[PDB]
Amino acid sequence: DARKNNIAAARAIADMVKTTLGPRGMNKMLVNSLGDVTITNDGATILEEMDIEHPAAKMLKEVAKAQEEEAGDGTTTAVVLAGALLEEAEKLIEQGIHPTTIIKGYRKAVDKALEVLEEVAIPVDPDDEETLKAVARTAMTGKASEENREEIADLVVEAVLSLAEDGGGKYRVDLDNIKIEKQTGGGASDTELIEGVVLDKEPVHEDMPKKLENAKVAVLDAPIISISSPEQFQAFLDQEEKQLREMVDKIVDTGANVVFCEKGIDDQVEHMLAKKGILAVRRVKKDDLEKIAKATGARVVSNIDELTPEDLGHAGLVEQRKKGEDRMVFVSGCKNEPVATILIRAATEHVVEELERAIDDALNAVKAAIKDGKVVPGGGAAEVAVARKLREYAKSLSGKEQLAIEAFADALEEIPRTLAENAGLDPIDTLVQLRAAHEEGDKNIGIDCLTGEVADMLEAGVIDPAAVKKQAIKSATEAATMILRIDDIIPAKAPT
């Protein structure tokens, strides 16, 4: 039963990532043969860099990548939903239903599930500050320490509003637009709007002018013998420094005094650069060099011979500040576009990476809420409500598709069970309580794992974007369907 094998692999992955769904998600550790260890709880990373020999499991890589690409939040929800769906799919094949009937029933169930989630979702305007804060805190939940939730949420909404580039209603709040720097120790209170891309590199030369107001900023990427007579070596050195003098002279004619180069340097090169007072940062990556080019306004000039004064950018200020331990050039005053890198502070490296992922997910969720403008109660409330209306449809429908739709409802309801289990509550009792609550007509009662009870989510500030849950259901459906659609593993000829 190769299908049983594939389902078992998907089940193993689903159970592995089940434990990391919620505020109290028990983190997982990623150890490799090199010995490096990273503590993470966002399921994206967990599905990213885990060893999977099984190819049916290896499809869930692509499922998670699609989820992150469209939605940016809800990979763990999608994988757990796929696990529960394949649970009930397996034991529906055990009863005797053909797999194609299961697929057809799941397709109908998920069409109606998306419709129901559209109906139940409560709308939100982009000016109700408390609702945006609630969305931000709910998504932000999972990975930060409990202390700095209010602070990071406040900074999230502040950055989203202040950097709100009104591009015809759809604000272009990109992940690489908001200004944070990474550094060990200190705290998260350095996630402020510093109008420029800050590089974690020291100045090459001490007497290099650290302060330069209205500096003429340039962006470069190029890397900055036969001897016959005794003085011929000195001659090659002389002409090399002469052509260096010529090129830096025509650079200075443009007026450039601040440079961030993509490649390395040499001691003599940086010395003669600092002779005139020129900043030079080396080994800047492709992505962050492009970001600096966008921010500073100086177009990247591979062939520097055609550099002109028109090609140069400008920055309001450049300053070297000894913040914390590491020395860095705190560039501030890049006035053309809001451009930045996803680099964020915390106490330790594990917490640094955790907070980086968490702030990224926070901006993703608030961006989705602003764009789509439909928010659904979280904490398992949406799942239970959709399961109830699916059971109503099952009462409407008849045949052996009703069994498949009931299976889909139970698989959807497995998410609140997991969310309660990770919170410490007993799963069956609180699940029955949620069902009883939703049978009384109200639809916002869920699970809030911070207080460890069942309560109204809307008054508890536990609300997730509608589109995130829609894409979670869709990705789980495609995962379960296309894992069910396989029959048997065969050796495929390797491309030569």
- Under rule CB under 6 A, which residues in 375-394 are in contact with ligand ADP? 378-380
CA distance 52 to 283: 34
CA distance 46 to 76: 9
> What single-letter amino acid sits at 27?
N
Smallest distance from ligand ADP to CB 459, Å: 12
- Under rule CB under 5 A, which residues in 61-100 are in contact with Mg ion? 73
19 binds ligand ADP (CB under 6 A): no
| Contacted by 379, from ligand ADP, Mg ion, a second copy, none: CB < 5 to 8 Å by type | ligand ADP
CA distance 162 to 156: 10
Question: How many Cβ atoms are within 10 Å of 343's Cβ, its own excluded?
Answer: 17
Smallest distance from a second copy to CB 380, Å: 16
Question: Which of residues 7, 45, 73, 84 is near ligand ADP by CB under 6 A?
Answer: 73
Smallest distance from a second copy to CB 315, Å: 21
Residue among 117 and 462 whose Cβ is closer to ligand ADP:
462
CB proximity list for 233: less than 8 A, separation 6 or greater: 225, 227
Exposure of 445 in the CB half-sphere (CA atoms within 13 A): 16
442 tagged catalytic? no
23 binds ligand ADP (CB under 6 A): yes
CB proximity list for 339: less than 8 A, separation 6 or greater: 176, 177, 197, 291, 292, 294, 295
| Contacted by 250, from a second copy, ligand ADP, Mg ion, none: CB < 5 to 8 Å by type | none
Question: Which of residues 88, 90, 270, 464 is near ligand ADP by CB under 6 A?
Answer: 464
489 to 3, 162, 272, 405, 470: CA distances (angstroms): 9, 54, 64, 29, 32
| Contacted by 141, from Mg ion, ligand ADP, a second copy, none: CB < 5 to 8 Å by type | ligand ADP
**H or E stretch at 488:** none
361 tagged catalytic? yes
Q: Annotated catalytic residue: which of 19, 45, 75, 418? A: 75
CA distance 266 to 199: 19
Smallest distance from ligand ADP to CB 434, Å: 12
Q: Which stretch binds ligand ADP (CB under 6 A): 18-26, 162-170, 344-352, 424-432?
A: 18-26
131 tagged catalytic? no
298 binds ligand ADP (CB under 6 A): no
Smallest distance from a second copy to CB 35, Å: 7
How buried is 488 (Cβ within 10 angstroms: 0-12 exposed, 13-18 middle, 19+ buried)?
A: exposed
Residue among 73 and 383 whose Cβ is closer to Mg ion:
73
Q: Is the dihedral of CA 44, 46, 50, 55 positive or negative?
A: negative
42 tagged catalytic? yes
Question: Which of residues 173, 370, 458, 462 is near ligand ADP by CB under 6 A?
Answer: 462
| Contacted by 227, from ligand ADP, Mg ion, a second copy, none: CB < 5 to 8 Å by type | a second copy
Smallest distance from a second copy to CB 157, Å: 26
CA distance 229 to 260: 39
CA distance 359 to 178: 10
| Contacted by 107, from ligand ADP, a second copy, Mg ion, none: CB < 5 to 8 Å by type | a second copy
Smallest distance from ligand ADP to CB 383, Å: 7
Residue among 215 and 358 whose Cβ is closer to Mg ion:
358
What is the bridge-based pairing of β-strands 374-377 and 313-315? unpaired
Q: Annotated catalytic residue: which of 19, 20, 40, 42? A: 42
CA distance 482 to 10: 12
Annotated active-site positions, please? 42, 75-76, 361
What is the contact surface with Mg ion in residues (CB under 5 A)? 73
